[PDB]
């Protein structure tokens, strides 16, 4: 297998719907991240959220193709990153652009303890066709980076406890059962909504380093801290990469 570029790196993806809740959710998350800075070397990546749904509504009404909608949704993830980095600026944290993440993450994490970036990958008008909704979104971009770096782990911070058998906020909440652990292949052959991109399960099948990814509830203080120490507080997704 290829070498690990940054084996000491920890990657954390913050869901856009978490940022959408405003200060009631962002302020406790910021204080938890502040206490984590002396413990880990962190790359924090933000998702898009509800604003990408509105630009999808306008863009689809205008008939624009999927390669047009992909950078429009990525813009909302970058704005969430600027907001989060501004709240952590007094701790030495700043937002960094994609080419900086791709080529100069090592020097930027030597200068400070953590940086913030956009979780969307730069596919832009080269997005894959098939669906009118861009497939390679925030979860997929965060995992591609973490596995390419050979990072120590990737944690996904959502607004629910984890993955259920059905949408716990949808029409069939009554039959929604929590899944403490699952494999990417088991999820991929299932039909129904998920809290993660379906393209995430595809890039997990070709991964080289990351063996597991945990999805935790960011609205419960302490669960992100516990997940970064390997404690089981959410849904564990096994990628299929085998350990030594």
């Amino acid at each position: 297998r290829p070498i690990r570029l940054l084996p000491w790196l920890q990657v954390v993806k913050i869901g856009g719907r978490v940022m959408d809740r405003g200060a009631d959710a962002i302020l406790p998350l910021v204080e938890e991240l502040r206490k984590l800075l002396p413990e880990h070397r962190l790359l924090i990546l933000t998702g898009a959220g509800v604003r990408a749904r509105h630009v999808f509504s306008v863009g689809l009404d205008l008939g624009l193709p999927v390669g047009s909608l992909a950078p429009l949704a990525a813009s909302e993830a970058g704005q969430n990153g600027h907001i989060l980095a501004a709240m952590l600026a007094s701790e030495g944290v700043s937002y960094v652009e994609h080419p900086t993440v791709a080529d100069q993450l090592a020097i930027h994490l030597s200068a400070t303890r953590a940086v913030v970036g956009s979780a969307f990958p730069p596919y832009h008008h080269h997005e894959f066709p098939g669906s009118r909704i861009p497939p390679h979104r925030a979860d997929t971009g965060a995992f591609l980076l973490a596995d390419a770096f050979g990072a120590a782990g990737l944690t996904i911070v959502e607004n629910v406890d984890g993955i259920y058998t059905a949408d716990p906020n949808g029409p069939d909440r009554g039959q929604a059962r929590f899944l403490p652990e699952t494999s990417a292949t088991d999820l991929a052959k299932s039909e129904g909504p998920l809290p993660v991109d379906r393209a995430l399960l595809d890039v997990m099948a070709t991964a080289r380093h990351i063996e597991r990814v945990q999805v935790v509830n960011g609205l419960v203080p302490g669960r992100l801290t516990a997940a970064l120490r390997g404690e089981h507080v959410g849904t564990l997704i096994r990628t299929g990469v085998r350990p030594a």
Partner: protein
């Protein structure tokens, strides 16, 4: 299906929801550049060969833009293969190799653009959005580099660290995104054969074939990158491609005129 029902699904459901995906599939379809043709000039097959191959194709491009709007992408070639071999021997991942390959395609686009500059055709970093030169009859063409922008976010192949989405895929995805009417791959063979014509003496020429028929006969990875055939089956706007021999005088001109030179590969 209505706009009000799509908007409600877009606000209340996950983007992974099948009901949302089905409603979005019924949206209108706008073609951004429906009158343009995307052409890929091969790196190893054409540009690496020098004056004998490039100069006649420059003449065809200048003559063709009088009646056809063109987006001209460039391949990489042997210098990218050298970079891939060095980086793969060091254990570097596919995302790192993807950035190395883009620089070679940029080199080839710069060399082609300097031969076309006196004719008014520019090198661009945003071909499908370069609206002014594509709209002027005095220009009517642009040159761009064919590598996709994935960089470190490149999806790796099932085995190995060679980037699976290179200049063939980058040029095709442009044609699909902007709703172009035609996609032509310019290589150094007459078309698709039953076997590799360089290493086999009894290969039979195939004028027309579908992607499914190619797979059932072991031809998935031959004249074109095997990932671009799967992209073709999922495309919305470009449902077939044509592969022609750029070393034959006038082959690109005749393909743009609707002549069935080379091999036509259909999605279905």
């Amino acid at each position: 299906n209505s706009t009000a029902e799509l908007e409600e699904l877009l606000m209340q459901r996950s983007l992974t929801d099948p009901q949302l995906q089905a409603a979005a599939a019924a949206a209108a379809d706008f073609r951004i550049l429906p009158d343009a043709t995307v052409i890929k000039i091969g790196g190893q097959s054409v540009i690496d060969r020098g004056r004998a191959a490039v100069y006649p194709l420059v003449d065809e491009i200048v003559a063709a833009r009088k009646n056809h709007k063109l987006l001209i992408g460039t391949g990489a070639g042997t210098r990218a293969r050298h970079l891939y071999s060095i980086a793969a021997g060091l254990g570097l991942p596919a995302g790192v190799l993807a950035q190395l390959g883009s620089s070679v395609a940029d080199q080839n686009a710069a060399m082609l653009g300097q031969l076309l500059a006196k004719h008014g055709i520019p090198v661009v970093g945003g071909a499908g959005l370069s609206a002014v030169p594509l709209s002027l009859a005095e220009v009517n063409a642009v040159v761009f580099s064919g590598m996709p922008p994935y960089k470190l976010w490149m999806r790796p192949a099932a085995e190995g660290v060679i980037p699976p989405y290179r200049t063939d895929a980058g040029c095709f995805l442009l044609a699909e995104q902007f709703g172009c009417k035609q996609m032509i791959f310019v290589k150094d063979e007459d078309g698709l054969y039953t076997a590799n014509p360089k290493t086999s003496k009894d290969a039979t020429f195939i004028p027309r074939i579908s992607v499914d028929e190619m797979k059932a006969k072991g031809l998935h990875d031959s004249i074109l990158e095997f990932p671009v055939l799967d992209l073709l089956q999922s495309a919305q706007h470009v449902r077939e491609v044509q592969v022609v021999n750029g070393l034959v005088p006038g082959n690109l001109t005749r393909a743009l005129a609707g002549e069935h030179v080379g091999t036509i590969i259909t999605a279905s």
